[PDB]
Amino acid sequence: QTRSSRMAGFGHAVPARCVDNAEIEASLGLEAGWIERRTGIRSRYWAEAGDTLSGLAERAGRMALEDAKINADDIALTLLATSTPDHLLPPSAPLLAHRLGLTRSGAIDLAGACSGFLYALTLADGFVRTYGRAVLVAAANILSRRINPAERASAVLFADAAGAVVLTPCPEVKRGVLSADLVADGSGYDLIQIAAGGSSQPFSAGMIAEDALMTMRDGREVFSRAVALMTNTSQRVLHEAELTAADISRFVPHQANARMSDAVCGNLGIEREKTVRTIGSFGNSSAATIPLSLSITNAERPLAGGETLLLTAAGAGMTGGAVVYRV
Amino acid sequence: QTRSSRMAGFGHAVPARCVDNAEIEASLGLEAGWIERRTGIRSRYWAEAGDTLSGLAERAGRMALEDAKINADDIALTLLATSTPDHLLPPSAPLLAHRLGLTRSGAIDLAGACSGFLYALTLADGFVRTYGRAVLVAAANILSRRINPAERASAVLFADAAGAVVLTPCPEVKRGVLSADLVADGSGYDLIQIAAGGSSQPFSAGMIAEDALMTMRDGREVFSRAVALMTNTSQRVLHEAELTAADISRFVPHQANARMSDAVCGNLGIEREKTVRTIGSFGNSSAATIPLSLSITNAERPLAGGETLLLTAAGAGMTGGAVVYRV
Numbered sequence: 001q002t003r004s005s006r007m008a009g010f011g012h013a014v015p016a017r018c019v020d021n022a023e024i025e026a027s028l029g030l031e032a033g034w035i036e037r038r039t040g041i042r043s044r045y046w047a048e049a050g051d052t053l054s055g056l057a058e059r060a061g062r063m064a065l066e067d068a069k070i071n072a073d074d075i076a077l078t079l080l081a082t083s084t085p086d087h088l089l090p091p092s093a094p095l096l097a098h099r100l101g102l103t104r105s106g107a108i109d110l111a112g113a114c115s116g117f118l119y120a121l122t123l124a125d126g127f128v129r130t131y132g133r134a135v136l137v138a139a140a141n142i143l144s145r146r147i148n149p150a151e152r153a154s155a156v157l158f159a160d161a162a163g164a165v166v167l168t169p170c171p172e173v174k175r176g177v178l179s180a181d182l183v184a185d186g187s188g189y190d191l192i193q194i195a196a197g198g199s200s201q202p203f204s205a206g207m208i209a210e211d212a213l214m215t216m217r218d219g220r221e222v223f224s225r226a227v228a229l230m231t232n233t234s235q236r237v238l239h240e241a242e243l244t245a246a247d248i249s250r251f252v253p254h255q256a257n258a259r260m261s262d263a264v265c266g267n268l269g270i271e272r273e274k275t276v277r278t279i280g281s282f283g284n285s286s287a288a289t290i291p292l293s294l295s296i297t298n299a300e301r302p303l304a305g306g307e308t309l310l311l312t313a314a315g316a317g318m319t320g321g322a323v324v325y326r327v
Numbered sequence: 328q329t330r331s332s333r334m335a336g337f338g339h340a341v342p343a344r345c346v347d348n349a350e351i352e353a354s355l356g357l358e359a360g361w362i363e364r365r366t367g368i369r370s371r372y373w374a375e376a377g378d379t380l381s382g383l384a385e386r387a388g389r390m391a392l393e394d395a396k397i398n399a400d401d402i403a404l405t406l407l408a409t410s411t412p413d414h415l416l417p418p419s420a421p422l423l424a425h426r427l428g429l430t431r432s433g434a435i436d437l438a439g440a441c442s443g444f445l446y447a448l449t450l451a452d453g454f455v456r457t458y459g460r461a462v463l464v465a466a467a468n469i470l471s472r473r474i475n476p477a478e479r480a481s482a483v484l485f486a487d488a489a490g491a492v493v494l495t496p497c498p499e500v501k502r503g504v505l506s507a508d509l510v511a512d513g514s515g516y517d518l519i520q521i522a523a524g525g526s527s528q529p530f531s532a533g534m535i536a537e538d539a540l541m542t543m544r545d546g547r548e549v550f551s552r553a554v555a556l557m558t559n560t561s562q563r564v565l566h567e568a569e570l571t572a573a574d575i576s577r578f579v580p581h582q583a584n585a586r587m588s589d590a591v592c593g594n595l596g597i598e599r600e601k602t603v604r605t606i607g608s609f610g611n612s613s614a615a616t617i618p619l620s621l622s623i624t625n626a627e628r629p630l631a632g633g634e635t636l637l638l639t640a641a642g643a644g645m646t647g648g649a650v651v652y653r654v
Contacts, residue, residue: 053526077509087525089410089473089541090516091438094644098513106509107646108446109438111418119435126453131507142526146416180458182404182433186425189417196530198414199380199469203523203530203539212530214416317421319434 002169004176005128005135007303007325009068009166012295013059014045014282015142028155035156040258044159044283046144051160053084054092057140058099060162060288063295064136065100068166072100075166076133078107079124081116081287084142085109088197096138105136113192113315114254115182116287118323121165121311122180128169138164139287146194148213157257159283163291178308178324179240181233188225188318192216222318227260229320230312231267238268238310241324245269247308250297254313255279255289264312287315303327329459329496331503332452334630334652336395336493339622340386341372341609342469351483355476362483367585371486371610373471378487380411381419384467385426387489390622391463392427395493399427402493403460405434406451408443408614411469412436415524423465432463440519441581441642442509443614444490445650448638449507451494465491466614473521475540484584485541486610490618505635505651506567508560515552515645519543554587556647557639558594564649565595565637572596574635577624581640582606582616591639613642630654 020043021035036042047056057080065072078100080093093107112119117139124135140162148154170176196211197203203212216222230253238244251274253261258279265275278293285292290311303309305327312322347370348362363369374383384407392399405427407420420434439446444466451462467489476482497503523538524530530539543549557580565571578597580588582605592602605620612619617638630636634654641647 078511083416084526085438086527087521088539089521090440090519090643090645094511094513094646095516096513097511098516105511106446106648107511107513107644108443108509111412111436111438113417116435119433123450123454126457127450130453130456145526145529182435184405184421184424184429184432184434186421186423186434189422189425192417194414194416197524197539199374199411199472200413202472203534205536207530207532209529209531212415212524316417317434319418319421321433 002129002132003173004170005125005167006170007165008168009064010295010298011060011063011067012163012292013056014161015047015051017046017048019044019046024155039156040279041283042280047142047160052086053082053140053142054086054095057096057138057162061100061136061138061164064164064166070166072102073104074134075102075105075136077127078102078105078136079110079120081110081120081139082141083111083113083286112319113317114286115313115315115319115321117290118311118313118321119182121323122182124167125177128167132169134168136166139291141286141288143286146214148210151214151216153216153219154214157284159285161282161285161288161292163288163295165291175326178326179237180323181236182321183233185318191222192316225318226314227263229314230264233320233322234268234310234312237322237324248274248310249307250274250276250309252276252290252293252309252311256284328498329456330500331497332455332494333497334492335495336391337622337625338387338390338394339490339619340383341488342374342378344373344375346371346373355482366483367606368610369607374469374487380409380413380467380469381422383489384423384465387491388427388463388465391491391493397493399429400431401461402429402432402463404454404462405429405432406437406447406464408437408439408447408466409468410440410613439646440644441613442640442646442648444617445638445640445648446509448650449509452504455494455496459496461495464494466618468613468615470613473541475537478543480543480546481541484611486612488609488612488615488619490615490622492618502653505653506564507650508563509648510560512645518549519643552645553641554590556641557591560647560649561595561637561639564651568651575637576634577601577603577636579603579617579620579636579638583611
């Protein structure tokens with residue numbers, strides 16, 4: 001009976017601490033204006049002590065359920081894309097579903113770094129279309145607790161946020177997810193990494209916190225690979241949907257830095273004013289970036305029937321993806 | 328055009344160190360025969376120094392691709408259910424796809440504790456049916472590196488293994504995944520936990536060693552909750568498929584301990600000889616147990632057309648799931 005999924009509700013959430021560039025530039029000994037000049041970020045939100053990932057995700061997901069006006073019994077599955085779960089075991093998604101009252105919902109976490117939401121969105125859409133039941137698709141990260149002071153990119157980019165979307169079944173064809181392209185390139189596996197705490201080097205007694213913080217070999221190599229991943233996946237879903245960049249109403253790339261968004265937008269020939277930009281006020285929260293941006297743009301101007309979105313992301317791994325969605 | 332998915336190829340892999348009960352009983356100071364008496368495990372495999380999660384997953388995945396005789400280009404997606412990735416960042420699945428030559432494959436990790444494979448299988452089936460493209464569904468864990476010798480259940484059950492299934496598109500209806508039920512119950516979130524390393528208590532200098540290892544408040548509460556989760560999800564997918572226990576050819580529960588498998592089997596009215604039992608030789612490797620058991624039972628006696636399998640699992644979180652699959 002079901003032939004597409006509908007993005008029925010949107011939500012986002014950020015912690016209470018707004019962190020201006022000037023605080024961080026002072027910490028790192030950077031000249032005034034450095035961060036906005038190089039990243040396009042002006043401020044970002046950071047967790048305070050006692051804030052949990054699942055609590056942040058809960059506020060974004062509650063906002064999306066409310067937006068969708070959906071009965072809690074209708075949520076069959078909760079997917080949480082996160083790289084920073086409350087605990088390494090269990091996953092945070094069952095706690096998320098429990099706090100939100102989603103008593104008929106399954107729950108699992110997805111770990112796809114910055115690409116996690118587009119994977120979760122593609123997989124949720126397949127579930128909606130196969131079982132004719134609704135899915136809560138959340139993405140949330142507290143990257144502030146992963147910040148490495150020696151890794152300047154992390155200190156200046158990383159932020160904390162959650163976004164969520166309620167996906168409901170729809171009988172109509174030729175709308176919803178028109179195309180999706182999910183790619184991986186593990187030749188870039190070592191470009192962005194946390195050395196310890198996984199199974200290859202469990203965190204042990206004589207280890208420092210910075211062994212458990214992110215490291216990056218060559219930011220420029222990450223930059224060019226990520227632009228290429230997003231460009232190539234975007235080109236493929238456009239061609240698969242038989243559309244051109246001119247048919248896109250809103251372009252929602254992962255918000256890594258402004259120059260990366262500009263590069264992909266330019267490579268695709270998309271008009272710059274079609275790009276949703278939340279990095280100025282919300283920073284880079286990894287997989288939460290796209291659903292937070294979806295919630296922000298829908299609040300500014302509700303998505304209208306017939307509009308076409310292009311979503312695209314790249315991530316450590318390396319991974320990438322793109323989705324064309326028709327309202 | 329695609330109406331169902333087919334489990335086209337199976338594979339599994341274990342590390343080289345076979346650890347019999349006697350070694351562990353001496354390590355823990357238990358009387359001889361204690362472990363087999365209480366768990367039904369006789370032996371299990373543990374990683375050696377330098378073994379990686381992705382390398383163990385790679386051997387299971389290559390076996391499954393070989394078994395499926397599939398072109399590498401036909402794999403559109405690699406899903407890796409694991410609680411023990413090589414690193415906290417990035418996910419291990421892109422490395423897995425890379426090492427196996429799956430140059431057209433997306434890749435993401437799923438964190439669903441012991442339920443991780445049934446979630447990944449259900450999500451993969453929806454992907455196969457939506458896009459008409461094949462998926463490698465892997466599950467792998469190195470639990471030995473997470474063992475707390477003081478938590479006796481974990482010391483005597485936990486094992487290291489990988490399993491994998493190649494899911495291919497199939498044009499026929501009334502076969503493949505007939506029904507699936509994914510549930511979560513975050514009221515049991517604190518029952519099985521690792522305290523440190525997540526975002527609620529990140530790894531730091533001078534962290535207690537035990538804080539990075541698995542912990543369990545009430546094994547009996549875990550037991551009865553997990554039995555109920557598996558019983559209730561299995562009853563649901565059976566009724567959704569319009570089947571009874573007598574129609575099941577092979578019953579493949581998560582291999583947690585023999586008494587748990589027997590309790591669920593008995594609850595469902597399933598003939599005990601229909602149960603696939605790998606816990607004796609392979610122990611409890613969390614999400615890997617069901618695909619390892621599929622690989623083992625299909626090797627002993629190839630899955631034949633018309634056979635019906637019932638798969639069920641419960642995990643930390645708590646989560647559960649069940650799948651009815653028609654060959």
